[PDB]
Design a protein around this ligand. Structure first.
Ligand code: MG
Ligand code: MG
Ligand code: MG
Ligand code: MG
Ligand code: MG
Ligand code: MG
Ligand code: MG
Ligand code: MG
Ligand code: MG
Ligand code: MG
Ligand code: MG
Ligand code: MG
Ligand code: MG
Ligand code: MG
Ligand code: MG
Ligand code: MG
Ligand code: MG
Ligand code: MG
Ligand code: MG
Ligand code: MG
Ligand code: MG
Ligand code: MG
Ligand code: MG
Ligand code: MG
Ligand code: MG
Ligand code: MG
Ligand code: MG
Ligand code: MG
Ligand code: MG
Ligand code: MG
Ligand code: MG
Ligand code: MG
Ligand code: MG
Lengths: 110, 95, 170, 218, 288, 87, 97
RNA sequence: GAUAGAAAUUUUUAUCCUGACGCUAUAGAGAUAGUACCGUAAGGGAAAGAUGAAAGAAUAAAAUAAAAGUAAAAAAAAGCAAAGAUUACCCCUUCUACCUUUUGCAUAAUGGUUUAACCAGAAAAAAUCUAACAAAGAGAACUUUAGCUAGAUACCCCGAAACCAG
């Protein structure tokens, strides 16, 4: 896969935006895709169960779980239902919050 | 339904499904009302319109058609000037 | 366990060993070539590709030969490459009717034929197709020497061809 | 020095047991063709006739004498024919299994790097005393880059040893690393394996197989 | 980073003696033995279902079946000969260009789209190529020389707003297989055949200049380009004064499949060399 | 112990014996020779002129493409006649 | 239920023989060999079972298609009977349908 | 209707590396053998071995003495034969054998003298769980508006009168 070419203006008209030049100081890191996209996905189960998956997470995953809870708390009025998978590196959130999650990771620069 | 064929060992399909049914990509199955070409002079105009209407299939019938239909007919199809291309996808389904 | 060589080849490699290997190469080359005969009973179609009438599409169409049975009586004469046709049929030409085993037999005549090479009159049981092929090939001797093995299909015809071809060679 | 671009958030070094299990079970299972055929009641030699009448005999009713109820009859289900157990775990899972195997053997102090792999002699007792002095466990898997480039002293030393096995770099895999108590890598094998495993993270899906000639791939 | 490697030092050696599958990955099989699964073991009690002679799937019990009482109507009549076109959005195009999967410096066609994995074409599913769809007409900022098989007017207006080239070509399924997979054709050892003419139904879509057909009259092209600009309210750029005009003017012969190649040429990629015919009948055939 | 030599696919051309009855007949096809030229070509030892159709193949291709694939003027006049008839 | 009265000779099998030491060496031939050969052609076995897996009916059909003209008379008749029986049982018999 | 079902067009690299997550005398071929035996004939077709280095060590020595069946050792009011127990085997008290089929079986509805060895659930279209990669997935051919790939979860045995061909 070729590297993304350097553009004079960010964000791109396609909405793609490169990660920050240094790394953030929070005790976790979210790897980008092989297509250089945010690894936040949707999943449907039994036709009615809607879930949002944060993949490719290295570090303290409970810190990311806590951060997702205070980010999603003022919109729902309650804590989001989450699952931590440490042996895979995966956070799983009840509902479709994927666009907000990609946006939040976009200001956080991962 | 032949679940394992004798030549290729695959699962066959029944052409009586295809010759009168249409499968949308949402899982919905489309069909004609029974008797729309029979005895038009005897039936009323509202009954004629009701028989001329297309209708959907419910859950048990749709699963029966999906069981008797192979995986070739469940693919995503992009025909030129398809009238059902607008009806292929589902939207605003809050379940 | 299995064979190393297929069973369908067991006639072919039988020809590759023993007395058959010392048999002459021109005879082996004439024997190995299995060319299709002239269509006699079934009427073939010329085009390899045809338009489907119902479907209105291009399709590939192939000539499949109808199997014909040759009785041992046919080898004593010249039947024109035809014989008994064994098959099935439907009564009153409807598909949903009874299935019937049916044999079709050629019409036979006792005619005497003059060969100019042998200067002999042979009383041969012949067919009207054989007489038509004689008249088309412009001679009895011309008919024997012009029509090949798979079109003639007679041991008597092969013996006649061998005799007059040997006569012309000597 | 590392010949590949290391990501900025991770410093270079100087685990997936589930994927380890999947690759080990796949390596055990995919070569297996079970050779066990028993004869059902159609394939048994005789028994094509009713032994007695249906009614009036006084004993139980029977058809063939080769039914699975009888003594010498066939087997009702049994193992049927040569049975092939062939499945392919996908390419990225196999690459990840190799990666986590090397990571586990590095983290468990069983991975040792040896520069260019020479020996002063072909005596295997020298290898045994080297392993006992360094406490390399019982079994040692030595790797080399190519089969024909392997030094003759090392080859003659390992060809008569049971716990010491020498393999080319193309023959290194998860069953071998989990079988051998200590893994030994040479520096060009490290440089070869790092490229061959780190290529798959930035790769596409194959339109046609990679033996066919791609632009940037041989 | 991987803090499990710190705990892996204290644990004993990982071998084949201690390997567990993922908990939940294997649902254990249940066999018909015992009091829990016995004496009927899931097959019911007498009837036809325990003996396993129950009828076929569409059979409703002597009643005429639901799939046999509905009248026939052609829904899939001629579906195997209806023409299919895989869609490509301008959002997807701008995403590929902005990620560098495909480039605008080179003229872009279905070959480099497949090479950049933006679309996948299955010719044996009777696709005839790629149709441009107008989902991303507002946010498209790229300048392309795009070669597709079908186009819509909003996508065309969005491209020559930026100043690109839109033209639409026909491929026979043989030539389209060759187009999408050239290297599997290049290991076939066959000469490149001629690109075929469209059928009688597909003549007028490529004959009129409103759809930018290849076979259209080039004199009717600029009035169509200016009519689109008048209709959609954008100033029409002067493409002749651009520095990439020799790139944007690159076209194909209607009997030619690839860029820079000709019918009858044979590509020997082991020697990296090209074979050309010289026979007069061969040249007349592959140039006719 | 020492490992076995690795299985490697030879890049030399492979040619079956045509006089052997046990060889398959997809290995004796002209398509096989064209594929071997596309794979190696220089070391395959086949003529490059065998890849092109012969005179009879060119004549039958000319007959097929002349019969079933009409000229563009013929299609244009056919659609013009059809449009005139429907108008 | 009468079990044997003597201890058997214990099988001294070694875990480090040639086959157990060299088992599964080139399973990553493609992965570590710049893909040229698949793990398919490492499989030693029947002609019809090399790199293929299916149930009993598809196995019998594949055997009759590959080596059908090289089987024996009795084996070919038995395979035809097994194919017919498996076809009838797999199509016309079952619970879940 | 049940179902039957191509082709045009495509892919397939040579040799060695072969033995067994197949059985151990009711299993594996029927086989010690197509032999005894049953049949006029076509045909059907078995069961059967166990000491040791030496039996040119049979006043011969060494390891189980464990199935049903008997003997050592017949029985003492009363009861689905047992349990609660008890100083005490019974005597006291309390419980209508087991499967199958049934609305309902102690039923006088079926089956079994007992012991040993055999004898009967088998398929992954859709789905659930787990993993890899994810707008893409898969070691070619396909599926894609969170999807692709891999794995694990599934569907028995015996029984006719009969029909056709030789
Ligand atoms: Mg999902
Ligand atoms: Mg029998
Ligand atoms: Mg009988
Ligand atoms: Mg009785
Ligand atoms: Mg019977
Ligand atoms: Mg026996
Ligand atoms: Mg047996
Ligand atoms: Mg179950
Ligand atoms: Mg089961
Ligand atoms: Mg139960
Ligand atoms: Mg029971
Ligand atoms: Mg019952
Ligand atoms: Mg009932
Ligand atoms: Mg029935
Ligand atoms: Mg009725
Ligand atoms: Mg498609
Ligand atoms: Mg009916
Ligand atoms: Mg074919
Ligand atoms: Mg025996
Ligand atoms: Mg006893
Ligand atoms: Mg009492
Ligand atoms: Mg009662
Ligand atoms: Mg009941
Ligand atoms: Mg009573
Ligand atoms: Mg009774
Ligand atoms: Mg009773
Ligand atoms: Mg009863
Ligand atoms: Mg009764
Ligand atoms: Mg009973
Ligand atoms: Mg009884
Ligand atoms: Mg499935
Ligand atoms: Mg009948
Ligand atoms: Mg009947």
């Amino acid at each position: 896969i070729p590297r993304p070419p350097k553009h004079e203006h960010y964000p791109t008209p396609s909405g793609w935006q490169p990660p920050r030049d240094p790394a953030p100081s929070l005790p976790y890191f979210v790897r980008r895709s092989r297509m250089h996209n945010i690894p936040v996905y949707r999943d449907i189960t039994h036709g009615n169960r809607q879930m949002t998956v944060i993949r490719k997470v290295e570090g303290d995953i409970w810190a990311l779980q806590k951060d997702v809870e205070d980010f999603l708390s003022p919109l729902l009025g309650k804590t989001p239902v989450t699952q931590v998978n440490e042996v895979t590196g995966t956070l799983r959130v009840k509902g479709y919050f994927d666009q907000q999650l990609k946006a939040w990771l976009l200001e956080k620069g991962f | 339904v032949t679940y394992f064929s004798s030549r290729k060992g695959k699962r066959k399909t029944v052409k009586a499904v295809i010759y009168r049914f249409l499968r949308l990509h949402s899982g919905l199955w489309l069909r004609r009302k029974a008797g729309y070409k029979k005895k038009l002079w005897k039936k009323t105009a509202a009954r004629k319109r009701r028989l001329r209407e297309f209708v959907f299939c419910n859950k048990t019938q749709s699963k029966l058609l999906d069981k008797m239909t192979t995986s070739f007919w469940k693919r995503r199809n992009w025909y030129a000037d398809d009238p059902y291309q607008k009806y292929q996808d589902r939207t605003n389904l809050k379940v | 366990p299995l064979h190393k060589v297929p069973v369908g080849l067991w006639k072919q490699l039988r020809l590759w060993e023993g007395i058959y290997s010392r048999l002459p190469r021109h005879y082996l080359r004439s024997l190995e070539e299995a060319r299709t005969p002239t269509p006699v009973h079934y009427r073939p179609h010329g085009a390899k590709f045809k338009i489907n009438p119902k479907n209105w599409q291009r399709e590939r169409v192939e000539d499949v030969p109808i199997p014909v049975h040759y009785p041992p009586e046919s080898q004593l004469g010249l039947w024109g490459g035809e014989g008994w046709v064994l098959g099935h049929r439907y009564v009153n030409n409807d598909k949903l009717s009874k299935r019937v085993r049916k044999v079709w037999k050629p019409q036979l005549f006792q005619r005497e034929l003059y060969s100019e090479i042998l200067d002999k009159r042979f009383t041969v049981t012949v067919t009207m197709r054989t007489l038509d092929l004689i008249d088309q090939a412009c001679g009895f001797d011309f008919y024997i020497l012009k029509t090949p093995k798979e079109d003639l299909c007679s041991k008597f015809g092969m013996d006649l061809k061998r005799g007059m071809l040997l006569r012309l060679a000597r | 020095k590392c010949e590949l671009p290391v990501p900025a958030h991770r410093r270079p070094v100087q685990p997936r047991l589930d994927i380890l299990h999947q690759v080990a079970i796949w390596q055990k299972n995919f070569k297996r063709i079970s050779y066990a055929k028993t004869k059902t009641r159609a394939e048994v030699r005789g028994g094509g006739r009713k032994p007695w009448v249906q009614k009036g005999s006084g004993r139980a009713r029977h058809g063939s004498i080769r039914s699975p109820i009888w003594r010498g009859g066939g087997v009702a289900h049994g193992p049927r024919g040569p049975t092939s157990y062939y499945y392919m775990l996908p390419m990225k899972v196999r690459v990840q299994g190799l990666k986590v195997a090397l990571t586990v053997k590095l983290a468990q102090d069983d991975l040792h790097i040896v520069d260019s792999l020479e020996l002063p002699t072909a005596d295997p007792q020298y290898l045994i005393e080297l392993a006992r002095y360094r406490r390399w466990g019982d079994s040692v898997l030595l790797v080399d880059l190519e089969h024909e480039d392997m030094p003759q002293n090392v080859v003659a030393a390992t060809s008569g040893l049971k716990t010491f096995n020498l393999v080319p770099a193309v023959g290194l895999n998860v069953h071998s690393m989990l079988k051998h108590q200590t893994l030994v890598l040479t520096l060009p094998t490290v440089a070869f394996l790092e490229e061959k495993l780190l290529w798959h993270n930035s790769r596409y899906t194959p339109l046609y197989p990679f033996r066919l000639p791609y632009c940037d791939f041989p | 980073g991987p803090r499990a490697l710190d705990l892996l030092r204290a644990l004993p050696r990982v071998s084949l003696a201690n390997l567990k599958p993922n908990p939940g990955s294997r649902k254990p099989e249940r066999r018909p033995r015992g009091r829990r699964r016995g004496r009927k073991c899931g097959r019911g009690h007498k009837g036809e279902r325990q003996r396993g002679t129950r009828p076929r799937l569409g059979f409703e019990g002597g009643q005429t079946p639901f799939y046999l009482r509905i009248p026939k109507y052609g829904f899939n009549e001629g579906h195997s000969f209806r023409h299919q076109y895989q869609p490509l959005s301008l959002n997807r195009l701008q995403y590929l260009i902005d990620l560098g999967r495909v480039d605008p410096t080179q003229p872009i066609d279905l070959t480099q789209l497949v090479n950049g994995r933006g679309v996948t074409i299955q010719p044996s599913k009777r696709d005839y190529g790629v149709q441009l769809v107008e989902e991303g007409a507002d946010t498209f900022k790229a300048k392309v020389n795009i070669e597709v098989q079908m186009a819509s007017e909003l996508a065309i207006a969005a491209i020559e707003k930026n100043g690109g080239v839109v033209t639409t070509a026909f491929y026979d399924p043989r030539s389209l297989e060759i187009l999408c997979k050239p290297v599997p054709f290049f290991l076939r050892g066959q000469p490149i055949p001629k690109r075929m003419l469209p059928p009688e139904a597909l003549v007028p879509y490529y004959t009129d200049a409103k759809n930018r057909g290849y076979l259209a009259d080039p004199a009717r092209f600029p009035e169509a380009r200016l009519e689109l600009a008048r209709k959609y309210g954008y100033v029409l750029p002067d493409i002749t004064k651009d520095e990439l005009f020799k790139m944007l003017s690159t076209r194909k012969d209607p009997r030619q499949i690839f860029f820079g190649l000709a019918p009858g040429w044979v590509v020997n990629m082991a020697d990296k060399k090209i074979l050309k015919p010289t026979d007069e009948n061969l040249l007349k055939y592959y140039s006719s | 112990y020492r490992a076995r030599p690795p299985p490697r696919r030879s890049q030399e051309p492979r040619w079956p014996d045509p006089d052997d009855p046990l060889t398959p007949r997809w290995q004796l096809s002209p398509r096989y020779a064209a594929k071997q030229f596309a794979r190696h070509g220089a070391a395959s030892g086949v003529a490059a002129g065998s890849l092109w159709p012969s005179q009879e193949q060119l004549r039958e291709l000319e007959a097929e493409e002349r019969e079933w694939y009409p000229s563009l003027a013929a299609m244009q006049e056919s659609l013009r006649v059809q449009q005139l008839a429907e108008e | 239920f009468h079990v044997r009265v003597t201890l058997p000779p214990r099988k001294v099998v070694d875990r480090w023989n040639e086959k157990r030491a060299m088992f599964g060496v080139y399973d990553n031939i493609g992965i570590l060999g710049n893909f040229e050969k698949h793990p398919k052609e490492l499989i030693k076995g029947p002609i019809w079972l090399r790199g293929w897996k299916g149930n009993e009916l598809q196995r019998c059909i594949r055997k009759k298609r590959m080596v059908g003209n090289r089987m024996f008379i009795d084996d070919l008749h038995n395979l035809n009977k097994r194919i017919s029986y498996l076809y009838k049982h797999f199509n016309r018999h079952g619970k879940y349908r």
